[PDB]
Write a protein that binds this ligand. Structure first.
Ligand SMILES: Nc1ncnc2c1ncn2[C@@H]1O[C@@H]2COP(=O)(O)O[C@H]3[C@@H](O)[C@H](n4cnc5c(N)ncnc54)O[C@@H]3COP(=O)(O)O[C@H]2[C@H]1O
Lengths: 349, 349
């Protein structure tokens, strides 16, 4: 959905005065047909009759005028009302898929002029926005909130299972018994969780001001999942992987490819041909996830720790003195790394 | 009913574009509140909000605008629409006996400004016009046609009875056997008939263009009745009476006085006070009616004929040469007088 169209959709999103007027208009079962132009006298050929108003916009003015027959003409920034009660006469030969004079008009005029045209039929409660060759249906808030509330509830469940996989993996990681299946299983759930966020995003945008709470909820639920999945990819890919590449992996399984077990492992660099093989492939975390997340070591410095000790298992055996020999590890980072690991080994294993 | 107000009623009479709009508005159960001014600027303190239109009037435009809440402001000549959807704010302390905000505003505003205000409420089908301290309710054509059609039917019955009275009177006149009762009975019926005409006149006016057939019917039924009654009065009053005098006696009995038998015969100059006396009072026509109406002798000249012969009976005895002595009677008018009376005597008596 092009950014160009999204800007226009904002014009009629909950919170704006225009949308507040359309809401009333929908509720009164008036229809509406609204033409958005900045230079009215250039569109003189497609606007016939009606009254020339040239007055400052308000929701209540628009509502009142919509009681009259025909169409309304506003400025593109919704600051002026230019015409009311007009007859819009776009070229009849422009192809249209719409039904009814109102919507067929809106589409043809939108195509003819490159401007926004808004149509509301008298008995339906949707707002149809036409821009160029685009058509976007904007839904009522109760409909959007229902989908979003379900989507969030769905996310809670994915997120709970992600947490349970993660904490199981944590244990395996600290005991160096991780198989590729555990890794892939965790990544896949994380991927799916983030896909859901991607799918619900348009509804949330569409909700405008009424989606503030929903955004906070998605934020709380997913706030560090992406960074976590990036560090998992860096800890378990077959060949060393820069952060940027790991993020591109994440981005791939969120959008382009489908997060299937075999596919994820293949992208991680493992020549596998069947899911049952994943349980036999032993792997060891390099230690980035633990070093960044728990020891608060910046990734830049993380690499230096890994280049030296290669795996988390070795890092967990290093003395403070050993760890200080790494570039970037003073006495505090050294004890942060060593105590955070021994603390986790004690508590979790 | 002041002529000032009658000019305003014309504005909304059948046939005008304004009335046409108002009929549509009544038909659609929209309401209306309309304010007629010549300089909107002068009245900007009683006009709040709404839309400045400043566009040419049409019925369709007024109809469309009336779909909106509030009031409409037109020029007094009903050639411009100035405002729509406005809030009218006349002085709340001005007395009014109207009901509901719409009609209380209308009457206060008209009183305050000296202008016309029109109110139509949504559920009734009347147009209320307010001018200064005047209120005039204008009716639908179908209500008016009903009363007028009845009035006409009533006039037909009065006119037939009048013709019967007259034809009997004629016979009596020609045989010189008329009594006061016969005259008074005929005048009374004539007076009552023209009263009915006077009373239905306001209905006729309210009908405007739709009153055209009604006016034609009145004209045909009453064509010569006034002249006829004037001539009767000149012929039968106690002492001789000038035409314009008799015209006033007609005016009196049509408008201000009741055409009771004693009242009529008293003002004709007879000293009776009991209705039964009229049968015993013998009268003889001067001859004006027969002279003007049948012999086609102009009143100015008939005076001289009555001057000389005094009564119809004596005129009917005069020979052509006898008549020719009168100032104005040549052989043409002399044979006209002579032959038309004798012709009448032959056929009627
Ligand atoms: N060229 C045509 N061809 C075939 N049928 C025609 C027609 N024009 C009108 N009709 C019929 O007349 C109905 C009444 O239109 P109305 O002007 O009162 O009310 C219109 C009008 O206010 C608005 N509308 C539709 N097209 C418009 C346009 N090009 N410009 C301004 N307003 C339009 O939508 C309202 C509902 O129109 P709706 O189609 O449901 O209903 C239309 C349609 O059924």
């Amino acid at each position: 959905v092009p950014q160009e169209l999204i800007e226009k959709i904002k014009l009629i999103s909950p919170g704006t005065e225009l949308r507040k007027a359309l809401d009333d208009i929908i509720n009164a079962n008036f229809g509406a047909l609204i033409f958005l132009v900045d230079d009215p006298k250039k569109y003189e050929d497609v606007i016939q009759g009606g009254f020339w108003l040239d007055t400052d916009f308000s929701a209540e003015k628009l509502y009142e005028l919509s009681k009259m027959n025909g169409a309304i003409v506003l400025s593109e920034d919704i600051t002026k009302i230019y015409y009311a009660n007009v007859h819009l006469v776009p070229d009849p030969t422009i192809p249209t898929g719409e039904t009814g004079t109102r919507h067929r008009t809106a589409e043809r005029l939108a195509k003819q002029t490159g401007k926004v045209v808004i149509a509301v039929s008298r008995r339906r409660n949707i707002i149809s926005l036409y821009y160029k060759n685009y058509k976007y249906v904007v839904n009522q808030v109760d409909f959007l909130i229902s989908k979003v509330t379900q989507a969030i509830s769905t996310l809670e469940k994915y997120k709970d299972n992600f947490n349970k996989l993660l904490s199981e993996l944590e244990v395996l990681e600290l005991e160096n018994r991780v198989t590729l299946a555990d890794v892939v299983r965790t990544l896949a759930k994380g991927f799916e969780l983030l896909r859901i966020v991607e799918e619900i995003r348009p509804y949330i945008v569409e909700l405008g001001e009424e989606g503030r709470l929903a955004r906070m909820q998605l934020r709380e639920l997913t706030e560090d999942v992406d960074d976590l999945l990036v560090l998992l990819i860096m800890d378990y890919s077959s060949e060393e992987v820069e952060e940027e590449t790991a993020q591109n992996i994440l981005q791939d399984f969120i959008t382009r490819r489908e997060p299937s077990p075999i596919s994820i492992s293949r992208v991680l660099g493992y020549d596998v041909q069947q899911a049952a093989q994943l349980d036999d492939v032993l792997v060891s975390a390099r230690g980035y996830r633990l070093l960044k997340t728990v020891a608060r070591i910046p990734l830049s410095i993380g690499y230096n720790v890994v280049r030296m000790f290669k795996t988390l298992d070795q890092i967990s055996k290093a003395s403070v003195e050993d760890l200080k020999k790494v570039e970037g590890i003073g006495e505090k980072r050294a004890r942060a790394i060593s105590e955070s690991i021994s603390s986790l080994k004690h508590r979790k294993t």
